[PDB]
Enzyme design. Sequence first.
Site, PDB file in Angstrom:
ATOM      1  N   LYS A 196       0.827  -1.196   0.000  1.00  0.00           N
ATOM      2  CA  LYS A 196       0.000   0.000   0.000  1.00  0.00           C
ATOM      3  C   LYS A 196       0.868   1.254   0.000  1.00  0.00           C
ATOM      4  CE  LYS A 196      -3.840  -2.282   0.132  1.00  0.00           C
ATOM      5  NZ  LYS A 196      -4.940  -2.101  -0.862  1.00  0.00           N
ATOM      6  N   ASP A 254      -0.140  -0.156  -4.592  1.00  0.00           N
ATOM      7  CA  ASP A 254      -1.561   0.151  -4.519  1.00  0.00           C
ATOM      8  C   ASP A 254      -1.773   1.359  -3.610  1.00  0.00           C
ATOM      9  OD1 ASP A 254      -4.316   0.225  -4.424  1.00  0.00           O
ATOM     10  OD2 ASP A 254      -4.571  -1.800  -3.642  1.00  0.00           O
ATOM     11  N   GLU A 279      -1.661   0.469  -8.758  1.00  0.00           N
ATOM     12  CA  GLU A 279      -3.084   0.179  -8.579  1.00  0.00           C
ATOM     13  C   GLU A 279      -3.850   1.371  -7.960  1.00  0.00           C
ATOM     14  OE1 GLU A 279      -3.659  -3.660  -6.921  1.00  0.00           O
ATOM     15  OE2 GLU A 279      -5.706  -3.300  -6.231  1.00  0.00           O
ATOM     16  N   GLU A 327     -11.390  -3.436  -8.472  1.00  0.00           N
ATOM     17  CA  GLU A 327     -12.296  -3.929  -7.445  1.00  0.00           C
ATOM     18  C   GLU A 327     -13.501  -3.019  -7.203  1.00  0.00           C
ATOM     19  OE1 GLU A 327      -8.757  -2.950  -5.072  1.00  0.00           O
ATOM     20  OE2 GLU A 327     -10.168  -2.635  -3.401  1.00  0.00           O
ATOM     21  N   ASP A 363     -13.889  -8.054  -9.605  1.00  0.00           N
ATOM     22  CA  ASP A 363     -14.130  -8.837  -8.399  1.00  0.00           C
ATOM     23  C   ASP A 363     -15.511  -9.474  -8.536  1.00  0.00           C
ATOM     24  OD1 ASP A 363     -14.606  -9.830  -5.841  1.00  0.00           O
ATOM     25  OD2 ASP A 363     -13.604  -8.157  -4.809  1.00  0.00           O
ATOM     26  N   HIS A 374      -9.448  -9.184  -7.678  1.00  0.00           N
ATOM     27  CA  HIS A 374      -9.244  -8.647  -6.344  1.00  0.00           C
ATOM     28  C   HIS A 374     -10.019  -9.481  -5.319  1.00  0.00           C
ATOM     29  CE1 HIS A 374     -11.301  -6.310  -3.187  1.00  0.00           C
ATOM     30  NE2 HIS A 374     -10.101  -5.822  -2.925  1.00  0.00           N
TER      31      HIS A 374
END
Lengths: 359, 359
Positions: free
Chosen positions: B164, B193, B219, B245, B268, B295
């Site tokens: 992240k 991400d 992401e 997602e 997703d 995801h």
Amino acid sequence: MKTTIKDIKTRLFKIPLKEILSDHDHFELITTTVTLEDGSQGTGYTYTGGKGGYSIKAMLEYDIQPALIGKDATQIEEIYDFMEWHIHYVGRGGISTFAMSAVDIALWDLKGKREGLPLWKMAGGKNNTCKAYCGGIDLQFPLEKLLNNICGYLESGFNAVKIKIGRENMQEDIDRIKAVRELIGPDITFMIDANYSLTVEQAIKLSKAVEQYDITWFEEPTLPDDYKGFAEIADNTAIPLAMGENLHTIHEFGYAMDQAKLGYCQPDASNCGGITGWLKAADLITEHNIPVCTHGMQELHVSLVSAFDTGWLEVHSFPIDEYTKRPLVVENFRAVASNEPGIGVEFDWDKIAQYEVHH
Amino acid sequence: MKTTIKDIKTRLFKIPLKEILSDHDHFELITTTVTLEDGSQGTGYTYTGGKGGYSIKAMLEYDIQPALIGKDATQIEEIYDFMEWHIHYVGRGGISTFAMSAVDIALWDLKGKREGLPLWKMAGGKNNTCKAYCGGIDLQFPLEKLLNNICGYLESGFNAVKIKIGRENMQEDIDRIKAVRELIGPDITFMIDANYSLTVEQAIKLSKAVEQYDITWFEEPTLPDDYKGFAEIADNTAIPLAMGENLHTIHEFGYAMDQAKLGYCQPDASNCGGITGWLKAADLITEHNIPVCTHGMQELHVSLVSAFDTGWLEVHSFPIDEYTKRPLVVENFRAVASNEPGIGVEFDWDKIAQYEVHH
Ligand SMILES: [Mg+2]
Ligand SMILES: [Mg+2]
Ligand SMILES: [Mg+2]
Ligand SMILES: [Mg+2]
């Protein structure tokens, strides 16, 4: 704080329609009552066409309301921003903006009562009455009944009407539109609404066939998601396009303003984020010099259409005003907003009590 | 009919996470069990990060399930189309596609058991194993803990990791990315991400600063709604962009394929319409020659990533597999789909019973 949120109470009513609308035999009303530390109370609401009521109530009572207790009701925009990211994962529209709307509206109710201001003022105050049209003349009405109902609207003191189109046999739409124009004469305003039931090609063909009858707008010709499809229809037709009650997100109004080539836009405060979210769409739509209109919820939108003073108020077929202490007031073909502090809407709780539903 | 839907049963579990993910201390699991006239049973599911569970269950039990009773479970696409327009007014994504997903997946479970086929076959069968990466290394981990966890993933038999980013101080992202690349060496696959927490300008600056560390994708740099913002980031950077997602609608995957200039896409199945809706996105994404990734929900997606055989499976941090009869099987750095007829997922009902919640 005296404006600290102390309790929230959401309620769900299933209210029966007197006529079928095409199919709906009732609508759902969600009311949300916010009580502050100093005892002040505001009530907002949202509504559905029969589906979602329980789902909205559930999100309000388990996801949103618990988190808002203790917040300062004066921080409306802060609270709105909070809700949007709180339920983001299961949001970006849908049920979540209906729930947001009910709360927001309540906070705005509180504020108007706090500041002794009516909503048409709080929302920009450019005017306190607005153009108005009767919408939702059912697709499934035979021609005679269609024409009669229209007679009834005009006779009741309206100067503008909208009918549903999108029949399997397009010749029937054409014939009906023609019929209605000839009934109402040249000086009545006439819109058509296809409830996103057409293909681009179908819409282009229908529009081209009826532009002679002086149609003010072509509402939701195809799927609201299909912005480029809207652009393609616009590019090949002379009737202005309109939507959307079905856009639930400021980003979606963004797409529409950028791509769809609309002549009219119709944000619904009940499902694009209450008065807060509605004003963002109204602001954006205004930046594009397109008339700010509304869908449904006329007892509330009369204030917001008037505040911006460019567009039309839809006198929707879900008669929510009828269950308030002020059914829609129409003077000289225009809808008149109320000077009552708050949002201008108070629910006849005794009347709707019988329609309340549980668990 | 023997495949006539006879009963549906939805259940809601609140399952505690062992680690905080940044903030989540638990996830919600919604299971939906569809029983047919001949006694056949299938179970599908969806999940949330803590919000929506009750709201999804409510829509399933009051809006959707009542309408599906008596329908023929073999008509999956017909049933999917039915649900999409049934709740359209309160849909176009949101809670409504989560609910749709749980049902759809169940119908697909039924079909695989009916036809004696595993889902990786039913979904296209191009392969039965896939690339896999460990995702969701928390933003809030100090550097040492970050590096340790990554050590742990690699040591467990993975060859790809995602962390992240999106800290207030961008220098901290840069420093961490640098740190991780140097820990893992040049032969490990590395994604980042940002959980849509950056502005276009911020994203462009961060990407430009870390492309030296050989990042496989970036992401959700900014809001998933901001397709043109994605395009603008892509146009000014050398790191491929990925999402989402958070797209819940085939139309939204449309916008992304048309505008966002992605290198990877991550539908997703839990929230874009079950296996039915997922396959539409996979089909579209494939038309654009972009790798089909997923995801979350790894115990299910291992089958679907494998079927299409182009993309990556995220080994998500909500450990749903752990509560099934088959925790994720990983052989030689690849996730292995199961040959069990149906969707390949069976819930250890005894284990999760304690986490069930009510009303
Ligand atoms: Mg309409
Ligand atoms: Mg035009
Ligand atoms: Mg992510
Ligand atoms: Mg690029």
